[PDB]
């Protein structure tokens, strides 16, 4: 068998990857790059094997010939006797989140407000909301819609990065990795929690996992769910218990991609590494938990129960689904 070379995005991921590599007896080793697109290039060069990707990045990777291998499966809403690895994935709910106290704001008055996005090119943070906004405004000028934003990966001098904050030192402002304070689901939801933004584009799970004590993180530890509302596309505002009726889209779960030539082996190695380090794995929490990182969603989302086998050996289009593929293609026409 060969070792599998994981690609870690930024130094926090790299630190986790190195602990995993040590715990796996070097069955997994680590390459690191600054951004997800760079990891994708290491994988296309064959200098890394795999990483787990949001569906907007799966589209980038898939256009370049990389293939989905296993998908993130979180706890199911409904009962299933099937093992996690075989239980079908469900898709997460992209939402637009505001503060309850910001009473006047709805979907229809977002123009000129401040927004917080997980990063450019990610599903709930970018492709879904900006694709909807471009379509509804009839204008590709999405860089001018919000007065200011944090949208990691955008030009650091532009309004789309104005609200980003960088790392502890204020370096790396707007870089699309966990060094940036407002990066990712938890960093965009923190951008809203701290009222840096008026709106955060994240998924439903984000709000629940970072409120009412579910996170002990200093910035989250004291947030109340009731202080937040979801923006629905019909212009109404709802409590965050209503995401199933007040979302912008259902997103394909994050998934591992690799070169086609390495997919079989990546899939076999990961199935084994999660038997050891996954949720109730033989060596988690004793030795190392592959799906934990103190809320920071490093390498995998912290809410991942297991990586699950895909039905029908799907291509990346099949995996993402035809509508979402078309939605991205249409939005990408703007650039």
């Amino acid at each position: 068998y060969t070792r599998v070379v994981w690609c870690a995005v930024g130094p926090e991921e790299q630190k986790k990857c190195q602990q995993w590599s040590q715990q796996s007896g070097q069955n997994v080793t680590c390459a690191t790059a600054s951004t997800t697109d760079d990891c994708i290039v290491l994988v296309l060069k064959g200098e890394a094997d795999a990483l787990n990707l949001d569906g907007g990045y799966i589209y980038t990777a898939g256009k370049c010939g990389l293939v989905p291998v296993l998908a993130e499966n979180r706890k199911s809403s409904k009962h299933s006797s099937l093992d996690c690895v075989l239980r079908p994935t469900e898709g997460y709910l992209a939402v637009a989140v505001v503060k309850k106290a910001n009473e006047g704001l709805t979907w229809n008055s977002l123009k000129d407000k401040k927004s917080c996005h997980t990063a450019v090119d990610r599903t709930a943070g970018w492709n879904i909301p900006m694709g909807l906004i471009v379509n509804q405004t009839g204008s590709c000028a999405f860089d001018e819609f919000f007065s200011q934003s944090c949208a990691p990966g955008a030009d650091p001098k532009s309004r789309l990065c104005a609200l980003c904050a960088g790392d502890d030192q204020g370096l790396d402002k707007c870089v699309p990795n966990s060094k940036e304070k407002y990066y990712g689901y938890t960093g965009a939801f923190r951008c809203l929690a701290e009222d840096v933004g008026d709106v955060a584009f994240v998924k439903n799970d984000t709000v629940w996992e970072n409120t009412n004590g579910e996170s002990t993180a200093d910035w989250a530890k004291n947030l109340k769910r009731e202080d937040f509302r979801l923006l629905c596309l019909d212009g109404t505002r709802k409590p965050v218990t209503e995401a199933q009726s007040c979302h912008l889209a259902v997103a394909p779960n994050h998934a591992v991609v690799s070169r086609s030539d390495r997919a079989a082996h990546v899939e076999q190695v990961l199935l084994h590494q999660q038997a050891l380090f996954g949720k109730n794995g033989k060596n988690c929490p004793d030795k190392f938990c592959l799906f934990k990182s103190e809320t920071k969603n490093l390498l995998f989302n912290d809410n991942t129960e297991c990586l699950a086998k895909l039905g029908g050996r799907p291509t990346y289009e099949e995996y993402l689904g035809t509508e979402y593929v078309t939605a991205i293609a249409n939005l990408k026409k703007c650039s």
Binding site: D37, I40, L44, T60, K63, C64
Partner: peptide
């Protein structure tokens, strides 16, 4: 809506 970005 075509080629690899890299």
């Amino acid at each position: 809506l075509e080629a690899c970005a890299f």
